[PDB]
Amino acid sequence: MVKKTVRFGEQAAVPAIGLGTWYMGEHAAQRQQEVAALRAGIDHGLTVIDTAEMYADGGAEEVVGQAIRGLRDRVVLVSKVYPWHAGKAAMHRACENSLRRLQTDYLDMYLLHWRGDIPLQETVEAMEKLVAEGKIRRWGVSNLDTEDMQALWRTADGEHCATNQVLYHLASRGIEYDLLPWCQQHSLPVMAYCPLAQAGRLRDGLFQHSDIINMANARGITVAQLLLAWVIRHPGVLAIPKAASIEHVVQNAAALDIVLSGEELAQLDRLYPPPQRKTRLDMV
Numbered sequence: 001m002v003k004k005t006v007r008f009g010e011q012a013a014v015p016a017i018g019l020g021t022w023y024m025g026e027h028a029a030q031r032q033q034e035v036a037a038l039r040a041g042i043d044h045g046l047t048v049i050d051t052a053e054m055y056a057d058g059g060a061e062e063v064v065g066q067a068i069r070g071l072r073d074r075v076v077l078v079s080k081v082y083p084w085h086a087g088k089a090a091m092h093r094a095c096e097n098s099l100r101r102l103q104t105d106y107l108d109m110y111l112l113h114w115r116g117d118i119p120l121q122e123t124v125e126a127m128e129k130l131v132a133e134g135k136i137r138r139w140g141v142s143n144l145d146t147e148d149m150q151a152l153w154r155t156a157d158g159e160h161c162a163t164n165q166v167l168y169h170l171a172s173r174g175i176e177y178d179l180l181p182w183c184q185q186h187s188l189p190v191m192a193y194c195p196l197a198q199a200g201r202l203r204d205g206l207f208q209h210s211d212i213i214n215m216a217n218a219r220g221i222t223v224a225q226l227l228l229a230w231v232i233r234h235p236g237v238l239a240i241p242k243a244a245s246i247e248h249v250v251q252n253a254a255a256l257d258i259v260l261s262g263e264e265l266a267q268l269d270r271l272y273p274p275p276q277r278k279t280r281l282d283m284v
């Protein structure tokens, strides 16, 4: 079967499952383990690594930095800037600091982490300057709903936006009503974060559901793998699960090979139905 890829920035076809790093860089005795988890993912064909300045207050970025040493040409590196750093007075410095901790001279992609009080115009000019200087190849956003994206498109050069990173998983389908359709209409890939719902922390009976467990068992796959396949069932969606466990990384990479039937998806629609209303943008 055809490989599941996404056009992402300057990269024409990245694999549709990448590597999250939230809660890496926190525990300094787990450094080497985290490096190996990232390295196993790259080994198994995943290229997109997603981090941020927020994550363990620079720690995640440092871990990713050691992990990608000698492998910069193998990875598609995405980081992010706090809304309060996303204007003239702090953009260059926050990027410079991310880059230093990553031990690299460029990002493939830089995302506004979420929307704050800096006018979008200012943020876009700041990003375009980083592009011009070669610090980032492309820029994008995170945690923007349909209305924020429309506001971004009304901004000069705001259509250069490369992705929108938003929460999406089986038990939180809100983006399906209006956001994913808008994104498809403008050829904008979505990065899906918490694609496993934090291994069921964000939904009490998700991982423990009866039908789900049996649907996984019949395929010989795990629940997490079933939920990943679900996220990337349609094109233009790049899931970024986090896995500091090698066993989990390898499984996540194998989720790329899973094509769920029309029967199975309708059953999942009965258990976790799509939205019938403009729902507010879910975030963690």
Ligand SMILES: NC(=O)C1=CN([C@@H]2O[C@H](COP(=O)(O)OP(=O)(O)OC[C@H]3O[C@@H](n4cnc5c(N)ncnc54)[C@H](OP(=O)(O)O)[C@@H]3O)[C@@H](O)[C@H]2O)C=CC1
Pocket (backbone or CB within 6 Å): 019, 020, 021, 022, 023, 050, 051, 113, 142, 143, 165, 166, 192, 193, 194, 195, 196, 197, 198, 199, 222, 224, 225, 240, 241, 242, 243, 244, 245, 247, 248, 249, 251, 252, 284
């Ligand atoms: N833009 C934003 O505001 C935000 C962006 N993000 C990004 O999205 C990424 C993903 O979101 P996140 O919050 O980490 O949650 P996820 O849905 O990715 O779940 C992560 C959890 O799932 C576990 N896990 C991973 N793979 C498996 C598997 N195959 N089987 C069983 N358990 C598994 C992990 O355990 P273990 O590590 O021990 O394997 C961890 O506890 C983050 O790492 C970050 O890069 C996240 C939140 C906010």
